[PDB]
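To the team - 4PT complex, inputs and output below.
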Amino acid sequence: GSGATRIQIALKYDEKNKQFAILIIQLSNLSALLQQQDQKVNIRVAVLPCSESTTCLFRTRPLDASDTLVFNEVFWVSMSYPALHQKTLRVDVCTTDRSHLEECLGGAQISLAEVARSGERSTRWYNLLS
Ligand SMILES: CCCC(=O)OC[C@H](COP(=O)(O)O[C@H]1[C@H](O)[C@@H](OP(=O)(O)O)[C@H](OP(=O)(O)O)[C@@H](OP(=O)(O)O)[C@H]1O)O[C@H](O)CCC
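Output:
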């Protein structure tokens, strides 16, 4: 069972509150990305380039590695729609431990230039690249 590890993500812009929502849903074929097992896994979400007025880096809770791994965490970011549209979303799948050191083994980048203003939300799957 070796192919691409994929992450499912929903994105939605809230113009009433001028905020972007990022819903990290789940991982599939995670076995393909890990050599070891039992490992803890979290997702690191970066909204780039990093606007240093607001917070641009986020992290899921860590979970025990499983080939399919559901996180269902939402992160909200304050940002005008024009600002959102210059942005790229970086999400990396990382292992971790009591050291708290991230071992981010692969990720995806998602240009946000075409996020809709409407709030009709976009849910897509993304291949990881290491
Ligand atoms: C960016 C918007 C913010 C937001 O709403 O995100 C909050 C999230 C998801 O909200 P929502 O209720 O709209 O999404 C459901 C969720 O994604 C579940 O996903 P999976 O676990 O991968 O199956 C789905 O069903 P449940 O097992 O009942 O939780 C369900 O998928 P579908 O619609 O059928 O495609 C979703 O309804 O809360 C978490 O689900 C927390 C669970 C209490």
